[PDB]
């Protein structure tokens, strides 16, 4: 693994311009193209984004890159966050990846609400924390991902996704 692979599995990966639940053009692993009801528009932003005559479809590698640029964008945000920054630094490589996957699915503001949870993470209390999450709205909501990510916090290994 790697963070890319862990999202491939959780989000999924689309290689041809598609709409979302919100009906915004997207492409790759949740790379929102533009939010204007125009195909042409998105098709342009796209080409622009990756650079060439893609015409609505990109390579698996082409998507990884965008995906990376968004992790980047998402972490940048995590550091620039007061509540998130501290825990994020106390994390090790792999559980850095679980947090991204968590913000990724329920953004900053949401991840931030996990107070007692973040404390324990920080305090490296890997099981009380696993526990403490498996009691929150979230696991109700997305029981499978929820689990997989919670194992990631338990172990600190790619077991749940390999």
UniProtKB/Swiss-Prot annotation:
Catalytic activity: Hydrolysis of (1->4)-beta-linkages between N-acetylmuramic acid and N-acetyl-D-glucosamine residues in a peptidoglycan and between N-acetyl-D-glucosamine residues in chitodextrins
Cell compartments where the protein resides: Host cytoplasm
Impact noted for substituting residue 11 to N: Loss of 84% of enzymatic activity
Phenotypic consequence of residue 117 to I: 500-fold decrease in enzymatic activity
Keywords: Antimicrobial, Bacteriolytic enzyme, Cytolysis, Glycosidase, Host cell lysis by virus, Host cytoplasm, Hydrolase, Viral release from host cell
Region forming the signal peptide: none
Any one of the GO BP annotations: peptidoglycan catabolic process
Reported induction: Expressed late in the viral replication.
GO cellular component, one term: host cell cytoplasm
Phenotype upon changing residue 30 to A: Almost complete loss of enzymatic activity
Main enzyme class: hydrolase
Documented effect of changing residue 30 to F: Almost complete loss of enzymatic activity. The enzyme is destabilized by 1.5 kcal/mol
Catalytic machinery residues: 11, 20
Presence of the UniProt keyword Protein biosynthesis in the record: no
InterPro entries assigned to the protein according to its UniProt record, in alphabetical order: Endolysin_T4_type, Glyco_hydro_24, Lysozyme-like_dom_sf, Lysozyme_dom_sf, Phage_lysozyme-like, T4-type_lysozyme
Chain sites annotated for binding substrate: 32, 104, 117
GO molecular function, one term: lysozyme activity
EC number: 3.2.1.17
Location, primary (coarse class): host cell
Pfam families found in the cross-reference section: Phage_lysozyme (PF00959)
Membership in a protein family: Belongs to the glycosyl hydrolase 24 family.
Functional summary from the UniProt entry: Endolysin with lysozyme activity that degrades host peptidoglycans and participates with the holin and spanin proteins in the sequential events which lead to the programmed host cell lysis releasing the mature viral particles. Once the holin has permeabilized the host cell membrane, the endolysin can reach the periplasm and break down the peptidoglycan layer.
The name this protein goes by in its record: Endolysin
Lineage: Viruses, Duplodnaviria, Heunggongvirae, Uroviricota, Caudoviricetes
Gene: E
């Amino acid at each position: 693994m790697n963070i890319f692979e862990m999202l491939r599995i959780d989000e999924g990966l689309r290689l041809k311009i598609y709409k979302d639940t919100e009906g915004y053009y997207t492409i790759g692993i949740g790379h929102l193209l533009t939010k204007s009801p125009s195909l042409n528009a998105a098709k342009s932003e796209l080409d622009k984004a990756i650079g060439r005559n893609c015409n609505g479809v990109i390579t698996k590698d082409e998507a990884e890159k965008l995906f990376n640029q968004d992790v980047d964008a998402a972490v940048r945000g995590i550091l620039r966050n007061a509540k998130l920054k501290p825990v994020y630094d106390s994390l090790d490589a792999v559980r850095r990846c679980a947090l991204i996957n968590m913000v990724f699915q329920m953004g900053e503001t949401g991840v931030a609400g996990f107070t007692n949870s973040l404390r324990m993470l920080q305090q490296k209390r890997w099981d009380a924390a696993a526990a403490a999450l498996a009691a929150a709205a979230w696991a109700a909501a997305t029981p499978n991902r929820a689990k997989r990510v919670i194992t990631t916090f338990r172990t600190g290994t790619w077991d749940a996704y390999k």
